[PDB]
Design a binder for this molecule. Structure first.
Ligand SMILES: CC(C)=CCC/C(C)=C/CC/C(C)=C\CC/C(C)=C\CC/C(C)=C\CC/C(C)=C\CC/C(C)=C\CC/C(C)=C\CC/C(C)=C\CC/C(C)=C\COP(=O)(O)O
Length: 374
């Protein structure tokens, strides 16, 4: 669900596309969509626009506000990219022609064997799940149902990697892939780690709060005393029960932790393990349909209903717990590397450590294949 429009400045005398002879657009990277719009205009309006190629949607927008072109094509996915450098962009423009487009996100792929990968995307926002934002949580869960082993692989939000699809395979912080869409995040991580991602789950703050509540809160073992959300919550060393608001604080805090984002990553992992413990309780398994009903409008997933039913019932019958291991991709913070989405800003990114990448990839393979972790 996205659209392409022809946009002009808010105060333009231009009312309709027939008044135009050309439009500025990034045909180098979004040509398929652009040509569809152009063919649509030629057929409904009998107007045949020439294209002034721009290097990107952002560059087109810049040309428009600089009075270097009268009109641009805007793909709605990229409004959220323009917004990164121009937060007021919406008030600067009007749209004079709009065409809706469609695309299904990731088809799920059923693993032929005992092992599958689920990508968990956590989005930086409250409200309706359809809201577009960056993906600040990016965790791969590798599950082997034969060995009963799960590996959580965390990739830091600032990891500097080639971003698939809308990212044009150019390097940027991983969290930006989320703005292009969940399929961009999925393909980005598939390419990084060389594995197929069978399924995804996408959720935001509002989704997470609901889930922890429905589960009765979660229990974790905390290793370091800390407080979260500007002091609102305090977590002592030891066994801690987390209600929903506490859990959200627990997975968001970074700066005061001994190891910063890495410790936050570990805290997120602790919460996942805790959620899994609740979801595999006999009560939760028996009442899985109620949980599906209670979360379906706030959590997106491509896990098929039949697959959920198989996973649940297998666990119901055989019982037995999964052993969970965790790992995180390591790197070095830098301020001097360019962001593809935000070419005018100096951003903090994490340059990936190649030795860590090799170890992380091998661990994913070991768990999938039923081999002991190194
Ligand atoms: C909807 C789902 C997936 C499940 C619900 C339905 C049920 C009952 C499922 C049961 C499945 C089951 C019982 C068994 C499945 C087979 C099995 C025994 C194991 C396999 C597990 C599997 C295949 C799927 C289960 C997936 C599970 C249980 C959990 C995935 C982890 C989840 C759902 C959430 C964790 C997300 C998290 C830790 C954080 C999200 C927080 C958010 C939204 C944002 C954080 C952003 C941030 C940290 C900072 C940004 O803020 P700032 O920095 O600006 O302050």
């Amino acid at each position: 669900e996205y659209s392409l429009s022809v946009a002009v400045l808010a105060d333009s005398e231009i009312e309709n596309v027939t008044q135009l002879t050309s439009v500025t657009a990034p045909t180098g990277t979004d040509n398929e969509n652009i040509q569809k719009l152009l063919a649509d205009i030629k057929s409904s309006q009998n107007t045949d626009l020439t294209v002034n190629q721009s290097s990107s949607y952002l560059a087109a927008y810049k040309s428009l506000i600089a009075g270097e072109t009268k009109a641009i094509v805007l793909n709605s996915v990229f409004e959220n990219i323009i917004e990164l450098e121009y937060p007021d962009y919406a008030s600067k423009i009007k749209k004079i022609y709009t065409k809706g487009f469609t695309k299904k996100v990731e088809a799920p792929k059923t693993s032929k064997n005992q092992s599958f990968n689920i990508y968990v995307s956590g989005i930086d926002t409250y409200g309706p799940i359809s809201s577009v934002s960056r993906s600040d949580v990016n965790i791969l869960m590798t599950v082997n149902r034969d060995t009963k082993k799960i590996l959580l692989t965390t990739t830091p939000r600032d990891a500097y990697v080639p971003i698939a699809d809308g990212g044009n395979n150019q390097k940027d912080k991983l969290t930006h892939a989320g703005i292009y869409g969940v399929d961009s995040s999925i393909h980005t991580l598939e390419n990084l780690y060389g594995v197929d991602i069978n399924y995804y789950v996408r959720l935001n703050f509002t989704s997470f709060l609901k889930m922890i509540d429905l589960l009765g809160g979660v229990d974790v073992h905390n290793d370091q005393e800390f407080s979260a959300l500007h002091g609102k919550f305090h977590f002592p060393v030891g066994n801690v029960h987390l209600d929903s608001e506490q859990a959200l604080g627990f997975v968001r805090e970074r700066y005061s932790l001994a190891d910063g984002d890495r410790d936050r990553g570990r805290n997120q992992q602790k919460v996942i393990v805790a959620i899994l413990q609740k979801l595999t309780s006999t009560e939760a398994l028996k009442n899985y349909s109620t949980i599906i009903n209670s979360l379906q409008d706030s959590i997106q997933t491509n896990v098929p209903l039949e697959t959920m039913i198989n996973l649940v019932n297998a666990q119901l019958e055989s019982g037995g717990n999964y052993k969970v291991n965790s790992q995180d991709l390591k790197g070095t913070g830098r301020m001097d590397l360019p962001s593809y989405a935000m070419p005018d800003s100096n951003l903090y990114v994490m340059e990936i450590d190649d030795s860590s990448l090799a170890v992380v990839k091998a661990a994913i393979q070991d768990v999938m294949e039923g081999r002991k972790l190194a």
